[PDB]
Design a binder for this molecule. Structure first.
Ligand SMILES: [Cl-]
Lengths: 147, 13
């Protein structure tokens, strides 16, 4: 029940929904369900907008996947602006990375989605954690604006 | 990153 652990659970839950890994009987939390619907509302459109760009990147490893994630995330927020919509795109992008990694990584570890979700949660809490605290948090700011 | 940024602002409406 820590701050990083809750963000890690959200990041890992979404990758399970993207890869369509079945969870316990009932689905994840209501917060992860609101997040999954909003990020699904985005993901397929982002892929179909960046097919030329994504078809030319080599996401062949975890470090390689982390390098590209850090690179895109630093330029997206290079204006110093954070909102709940931009946070949704952080989850939407990790879903595209894990699908490119699944198709390009040779001999992956079991549950590689847990490794990708880990450094994705590190970025969210280190660079948007203080902002999330100051705009209602997850149960009062995010859910209450998309539900 | 430009794409994702405006996809995000879009939903912030
Ligand atoms: Cl970029």
């Amino acid at each position: 029940d820590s701050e990083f652990g809750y963000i890690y659970r959200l990041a890992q839950d979404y990758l399970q929904s993207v890869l369509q890994i079945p969870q316990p009987g009932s689905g994840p939390s209501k917060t992860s369900r609101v997040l999954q619907n909003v990020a699904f509302s985005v993901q397929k459109e982002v892929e179909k907008n960046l097919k030329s760009c994504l078809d030319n990147v080599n996401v062949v490893s975890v470090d390689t996947a982390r390098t590209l994630f850090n690179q895109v995330m630093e330029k997206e927020f290079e204006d110093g602006i954070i909102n709940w919509g931009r946070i949704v795109t952080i989850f939407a992008f990790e879903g595209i990375l894990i699908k490119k990694l699944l198709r390009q990584q040779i001999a992956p570890d079991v549950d590689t989605y847990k490794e990708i979700s880990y450094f994705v949660a590190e970025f969210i809490m280190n660079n948007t954690g203080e902002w999330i605290r100051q705009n209602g948090g997850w149960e009062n700011g995010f859910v209450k604006k998309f539900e | 990153x430009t794409x994702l940024r405006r996809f995000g602002d879009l939903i912030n409406f």
